[PDB]
Hints:
This is RNA polymerase sigma factor SigA. It contains three helices and no strands. It is mainly alpha-helical. It starts with a helix and ends with a helix. The protein binds one DNA strand through residues 18-19, 21-23, 25-26, 29-30.
Amino acid sequence: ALRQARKDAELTASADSVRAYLKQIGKVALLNAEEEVELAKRI
DNA sequence: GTATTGACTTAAAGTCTAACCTATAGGATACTTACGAGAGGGACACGGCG
């Protein structure tokens, strides 16, 4: 229902392409300090 | 007047040095989604017949 409409809106054209880039970047969330330390040690 | 040579001075330039541009890098608290009509053609929905 509501989640179905969410998934339907997840697949739209978005001809602006800045809105498309924003919906693309919306996929990945933030991180906090300890995982930053872990990533730095790994790299 | 028209043919010369021998000095005699003069304005215009290759090269070394200095400053003034130019390409380039760097700069740690933590901050995470802007602001009219007029006609033709193609695509999506809905209903009809075998």
